[PDB]
Design a binder for this molecule. Structure first.
Ligand code: NA
Ligand code: NI
Length: 109
């Protein structure tokens, strides 16, 4: 029941909230200065919008996999490590980075 997290750095947070509310037919689950997120059931998705002041276009901020509990984060951390990937754990999260620099977190909310 895990789901992808897509975090986008957007030049215009307000415009982006409006667009994504239309695209996914639902409003944001959380709104803070410079930040919003959407919890989408179908397709299963955690969409995070981070305002990038002065940015000329939307870019990838980071990626992730949102899992149900801490045990699953721990399982993923061990599995990824034993596969030979360099990992950094928080505590609950584990981070890895792809060869072109894109960061992924496996995390529980
Ligand atoms: Na990008
Ligand atoms: Ni995140």
């Amino acid at each position: 029941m895990s789901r992808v997290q897509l975090a986008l750095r957007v030049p215009d947070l307000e415009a982006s909230i409006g667009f994504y509310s239309k695209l996914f037919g639902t409003g944001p689950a959380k709104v803070r200065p410079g930040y919003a997120n959407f919890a989408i059931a179908e397709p299963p998705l955690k969409l995070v919008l981070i305002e990038g002041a002065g940015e000329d276009a939307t870019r990838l901020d980071h990626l992730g996999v949102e899992v149900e509990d801490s045990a699953q984060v721990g399982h993923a951390a061990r599995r990824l490590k034993e596969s030979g990937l360099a990992t950094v754990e928080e505590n609950d999260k584990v981070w890895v980075t792809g060869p072109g620099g894109e960061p992924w977190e496996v995390y529980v909310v």
